[PDB]
Structure 1
């Protein structure tokens, strides 16, 4: 854009290139993303919450779309890589999960889904805050994209997925912060689906009614037994493992909502620590 002075290139997203920019008039530092869609994006400008990255403006010029966002100094992916030797302390993991669930509860109450939650679109500041970026952009529009945080209902071909997909994604991220390794690191749709099955057990009509009738379900899927959560996410306590299991329930209807997750005993001693950020 003409009104913005590009500082540097942040990275490459799912829709386009993300830039760090400065407004020539106001002097504000922003994040500029270069991409019926116009109306859906304009609805997200009103979706404001302290845990949702603020969409400042929507610029439509020369058949190209520019999305102006609030700037945050680091993403969760880079923060995880920078804390891989010592580990992100548990009180900070709990704070992050609590704040992200608050942001999810807000958007979900307004019927807005993320659909593509990953450590890369979770942004953090020096104040101990964590924010969700690119919310609702999947409904508006539609490099290898990661399947690691994708819910099984999406992998099994369900066209009409719910808010429960974001809970699954956040549960995979929760597990990753604790273990310092991706929960389900799939490199294909079937590898993703089979890694889920190997850990949580191949779903049947008992744990998930209607799973055998799903578009991409195949009766030939190998039958693996469920592994205990104590083996999946050590040294996470009983409260955390219980919340994780409810966030990772196969059936989208049994899967805990963001609002109910905020009331879970794991958040009894939740606080808001300040992270160690070297920018």
Structure 2
């Protein structure tokens, strides 16, 4: 059928290169086009899940790479978070369930995202959470053999303490930690510390269980009991996702 391959770039969605909203000339189907890499496309070709931004394909027009990705009309989770407030606890729980489904899927195929934050968690028309941007993502399991990580990747307020203290670390507890910081931000509208280091006063207060301070004071005891299990300094003692799925607040009916 003629012109079905032609796309009009209608609106800017973000900057990195850049992300533009493309509309099909014939079908009017909307897609996000990422203008820029080889690892990102390779990892994206492996992905197929309802809580992961869909990869439609790629095309190179010279030195420029075009990534055709799922357009998420609901925008970023970041913009659903009211500063210093957060969002209704039932909304945060539903987003947290969908975030866990996405992360279980990635870890199951041996992929770690390494930069989980509300800017990278997009929402479709029905407010379904989609994990976005696999530019920092890497394979941590291949031929059923786990590879320990050593590279500094991520965003300091969401990074796990072992990434700053240890030479090598397991990939999965790092993504679990960033998910707990996202959960904190959804329930309090603020990040608990600039970074998880002993030099950071806010981080020291948390390790000393001073939950009468912000952001913890704004969080109900049931989701706060979950955060006490996720934001554990020792990654070997940190709660795993199968155990998060058994948590009392995770399973609390909320309306």
TM-score by length of 1: 0.74
Q: Which runs of structure 2 are paired with 1:241-256 in the superposition (5 Å)?
A: 241-256=224-239
Structure 1 position 6 matched with structure 2 position 15: no
The one of the two structures with greater contact order (alpha-carbon pairs below 8 A, sep at least 6) is 1
Note if 1:170 corresponds to 2:150: no
Instruction: Report the counterpart of residue 200 of structure 1 in structure 2.
Output: 206
Structure 2: distance between partners of 1:138 and 1:184: 24
Which is richer in strand? Answer: 2
State how far apart, in whole Å, the 2-side matches of 1:29 and 1:270 are. Answer: 35
User: Tell me, which stretches of 5 or more residues in structure 1 are unaligned?
Assistant: 202-225, 274-279
For residues 160 and 86 of structure 1, the distance between their equivalents in structure 2, rounded to whole angstroms, comes to 33
Asked if structure 2 preserves the Cα contact closer than 8 Å seen for 1:229 and 1:245, the reply is no
Cα offsets for 1:160-208 (capped at 9, x unmatched): 441111111111111111111122235xx97x9625642333xxxxxxx
Q: Unaligned regions of 5+ residues in structure 2, if any? A: 140-150
Residue in structure 1 matched with residue 80 of structure 2 by the alignment? 79
Contact 1:41 1:137 (C-alpha < 8 Å) held by counterparts: no
Which of 151, 156, 168 is residue 165 of structure 2 equivalent to? 156
Corresponding position: 1:228 with 2:210: yes
Quote the RMSD (CA, aligned, Å): 2.8
Name the residue aligned to 2:126. 127
Cα distance in 1 for partners of 2:165, 2:202 equals 12
From the superposition, tell whether residues 122 and 62 of structure 1 become closer, same or farther in structure 2 (CA, over 3 Å): same
Q: Distance in 1 between matches of 2:201 and 2:168?
A: 22
User: Which residue matches 1:257?
Assistant: 240
Moved over 6 A (4+): none
Q: Under a length normalisation based on structure 2, what TM-score does the superposition of the two structures give? A: 0.80
